[PDB]
Design a protein around this ligand. Structure first.
Ligand SMILES: [Mn+2]
Ligand SMILES: [Mn+2]
Ligand SMILES: [Mn+2]
Ligand SMILES: [Mn+2]
Ligand SMILES: [Mn+2]
Ligand SMILES: [Mn+2]
Ligand SMILES: [Zn+2]
Ligand SMILES: [Zn+2]
Lengths: 163, 365, 365, 163
DNA sequence: CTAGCACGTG
DNA sequence: CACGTG
DNA sequence: TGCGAAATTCCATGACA
DNA sequence: ATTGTCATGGAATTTCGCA
DNA sequence: CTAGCACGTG
DNA sequence: CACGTG
DNA sequence: TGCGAAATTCCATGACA
DNA sequence: ATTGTCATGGAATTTCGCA
């Protein structure tokens, strides 16, 4: 009933394990619901601790109303609940064995996994170092359904690194 | 010989006729209401003025008074000031009585990421083995990122900025000429990403004012939060960084976060006015805001200010002068006036240099 | 309960009737041109204002904006400022936006030796094993003595001043609160000679301005004379001291030596106007001069200055605050106003203290 | 033909040897001609060197047109001449075996020697320390021929230490 | 009261 | 040895 | 009894801390 | 329970030299 | 960029 | 190791 | 369409260097 | 071959609530 805004929901999963690039094995994927903006964080494991550490970075920049995830141990710990409560973030969960992201996000992690794959092919253990560029692309790829890329939706400006 | 004609009742341009000039004890004198003074030849006045001056290396009137205790000649001060403009010792040691031009209030960067400002706060009381904070302020918005480092390294700057560029790449990055910003390692890191490095004029932190001024609210908040408590600032940086990016600037009536996104995140007392609007309907309004913002005007020029002119003789403040050492380099020439507050000169080491007029004085006389 | 009557169409002083107040989701709201805001009970406003404030420990309007993103109640700023005047963290950390009163231009001491000014210059580049200079400026004249010492000892001060008192004994000796001046050894040395010790307010060198300003012309001359030359200032002190005592002050049109003696010594460019006069005829004129001198007027009070009133709540600048430590002591009370620029307070350690308003700010709110 | 001023002539002799008070044996006496103002300087010997050192102190405060002395080796050295020349001071000498000071000065060194004597009696080896006070008295004793003490003639003001 | 320190470049 | 003032 | 030039005075600025 | 000061050099102003 | 140092007192 | 900038 | 109070705005001051 | 800035709180001002 109310038009969707950035920060209204942040979606996560992990994507791993991957080949050890400089010591990092998993990747915490954060995507904004409305803009489709994406933050990646290389973590050494999909523990709540690596998750908290990474989101502690994000939640310095912005804080979402809802964090939507699946039922990974990383996301369903008592700790993680206590973590979200302190910051006023609501935790919504996808029903187990039934991903309930959204069309925009569905294609987004699609776009990310497809993006990540190229790196495994091209750069066998240099993927870590390139997470920023990936993140740039993901945030600079245009959109069909919307005429805009996230970097225009999140900031309202053309990027100085378009794709 | 020039004075011989005075004694022959002849008029000489500058020597008033009404006065009686005469000889006494081998010297030409003149009865003045001041008293009886000596009129030395032109050939000795340069020496006399030098003699009087070098007593205390005194200024104009202070040197004139000395001379006028004994001598008189037409336009003494002309013969005085001529040497003042050549006593290197006074030129390089004496302070200026001219205030700089009025400050520029440069146009606020148009969009976010148009220009970053970067600076280092520190050293600080070691918290978690960290000492410095790399502050990154976005020009347009003021949205600020705070990265803790162990040293003002080139390394720590890149290793932090990469995390930031991940979000977005900025056109220009502005900063003082600190070692980590002026290094080749960084210059090149910027080139990989098509980032243009802008550099503030040296010994002029107000040029990085955007960030220095943010340094205050950062330090000031840190201070309030550590009252009656040990100084462990590391665990507080994010807290501050969020807290500050969402703190209204009463003049604008917007917060840096707002200026960057157009909507509040899930922070306390979050503004919900755009909740009815669509993102487009709300993203349009943000484009208007960013332009319809407030722009400080250039302040009135000081009653006795000085603005630099090409070719004009000027000197540059000595950076760290030793104890009992002159605070001004020898006079240099103005090559190019970048603006009423910035100048290219020809420095004392025979180099091209861009300095703020704050570190210049117009060479007197 | 107070809000219950609003919903019963009853008017309550401060709640404008024209507005429609109602209930929604367990909260009393009000449709404003601002938007729809919540009217919390009085019992929760103190907490709410505290909640908003503690985010960035923001000032008035910055805290108001936060609250006005959600709530509305009559005279929010009153409920805001009430807490601002009690958040110790902000009171002790925030800077002042009030400039001090305009400076006093105290009457120049009437005769020579009415008041000395003493100060220490240094440390300096070791010359002849010496590091400091004890400067003694005569109040009335400005006649200055320069004594080289190895340390700012009480000893070196006495061992120098005895040579000076040999010439004459001064009524008052003025000085900052440097260890050598505040020691019992010196206090007592002054008592033997019926010298009254005057002491400048702490962390306020302009109170010893007479001498500090002389420190300049001393350092400045030393600098000019050591250009392109090692820093051996010891052998030059007398040279400077003579040179300076006989250097005209253009405003007065007299030199310190002149003001002290009424005639020039055998120095270069010596004024001979009183040569016809007898010493009496010339000593009379000197009494007229010393009185007919020039007196600087008190400058205009700053557009937003503050003058101290007895009983008023004020705080004292922390001398050396540590890194990330508040720069203001807790609020103190004004006990006695010695003058529009000097105050006796009750310091943070429960002591009587005399401070210059330069190191005070009026406690805000 | 021109009325006498302070600094117009400074008269010197030594007065010594005296009992070793803290190491000082002689005393260089400087007296201003016109005011009768007196400066004493304890020197370890009446060499030109001690004389120069002491006058180097005085000539920081004021510089006299003439320095008038007797023909002591201290005052007639080539050095001392070169010393006075550099500062523009003229050196006048009393004819040997014939003191040519002046009435004011004659009585002054009289007043000083009489003053110094009291110290030898009272304080056998503490005279050094009291040179300042002596100097104060000498400069604060009134005068017959003139209604004033030197400290009023040299400065034009009443002293804050009168006698 | 003014000395330090850090960094990166020849 | 710490604190105040410089 | 005025006019132009020259000498004096004013005064903001900065440094001493 | 003490207090800003003054050398400096362009500019503003007053004074001076000559009718 | 901010740490020092000096001194004299409990 | 010294110099520049901070 | 005016009046008093309340809310907003102005802005000099200081700190970041 | 670059450029001061902004949170702050009394005061000045503009706006608001009610006729
Ligand atoms: Mn998963
Ligand atoms: Mn810096
Ligand atoms: Mn001092
Ligand atoms: Mn003899
Ligand atoms: Mn001092
Ligand atoms: Mn800085
Ligand atoms: Zn000079
Ligand atoms: Zn607070």
């Amino acid at each position: 009933d109310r038009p969707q805004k950035p920060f209204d929901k942040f979606f996560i999963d992990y994507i791993g394990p991957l080949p050890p690039s400089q010591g990092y094995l998993y990747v915490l994927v954060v995507v904004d619901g409305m803009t489709g903006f994406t933050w990646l964080y290389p973590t050494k494991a999909p523990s709540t601790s690596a998750t908290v550490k990474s989101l502690n970075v994000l939640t310095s920049i912005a804080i979402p109303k809802v964090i939507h995830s699946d039922q990974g141990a990383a996301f369903t710990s008592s700790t993680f609940a206590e973590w979200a409560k302190e910051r006023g973030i609501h935790l919504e969960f996808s029903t187990p064995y039934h991903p309930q992201s959204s069309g925009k996000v569905e294609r987004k992690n699609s776009d990310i996994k497809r993006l990540l794959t190229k790196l495994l092919v091209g750069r066998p253990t240099k993927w870590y170092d390139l997470l920023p560029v990936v993140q740039l692309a993901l945030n600079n790829t245009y959109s069909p359904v919307l005429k805009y890329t996230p970097h225009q939706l999140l900031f309202g400006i053309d990027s100085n690194t378009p794709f | 010989a020039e004075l011989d004609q005075l004694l022959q009742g002849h008029y000489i341009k500058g020597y008033p006729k009404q006065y009686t000039y005469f000889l006494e004890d081998g010297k030409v004198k003149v009865s003045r209401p001041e008293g009886v003074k000596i009129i030395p030849p032109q050939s000795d006045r340069q020496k006399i003025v030098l003699q009087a001056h070098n007593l205390a290396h005194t200024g104009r009137e202070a040197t004139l008074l000395k001379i006028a205790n004994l001598y008189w000649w037409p336009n003494m001060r002309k013969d005085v000031v001529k040497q003042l403009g050549r006593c290197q010792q006074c030129l390089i040691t004496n302070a200026s009585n001219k205030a700089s031009g009025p400050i520029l209030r440069p146009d606020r960067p148009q969009k976010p990421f148009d220009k970053f400002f970067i600076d280092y706060i520190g050293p600080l009381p070691p918290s978690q083995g960290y000492l410095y904070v790399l502050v990154v302020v976005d020009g347009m918005t003021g949205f600020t990122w705070l990265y803790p480092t162990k040293a003002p390294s080139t390394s720590a700057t890149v290793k932090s900025l990469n995390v930031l560029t991940s979000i977005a790449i900025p056109k220009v990055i502005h900063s003082d000429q600190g070692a980590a910003f002026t290094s080749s390692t960084f210059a090149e890191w910027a080139k990989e990403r098509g980032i243009h490095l802008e550099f503030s004029t040296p010994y002029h932190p107000q040029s990085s004012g955007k960030v220095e001024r943010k340094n205050s609210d950062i330090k000031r908040l840190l201070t309030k939060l550590l009252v009656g408590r040990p100084t462990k600032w590391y665990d507080l940086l994010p807290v501050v960084q969020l807290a500050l990016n969402n703190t209204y600037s009463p003049v604008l009536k917007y917060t840096p976060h707002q200026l960057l996104f157009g909507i509040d995140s899930n922070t306390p007392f979050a503004n919900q006015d755009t909740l009815d609007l669509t993102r487009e309907e709300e993203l349009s309004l943000l484009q208007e805001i960013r332009t319809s913002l407030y722009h400080p005007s250039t302040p009135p020029a000081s009653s006795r200010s000085w603005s630099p002119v090409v070719g004009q003789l000027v000197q540059e403040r000595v950076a760290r002068p030793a104890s009992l050492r002159p605070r001004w380099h020898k006079p240099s020439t103005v090559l190019k006036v970048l603006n009423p507050r910035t100048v290219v000169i020809l420095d004392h080491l025979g180099n091209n240099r861009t300095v703020s007029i704050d570190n210049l004085k117009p060479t007197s006389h």
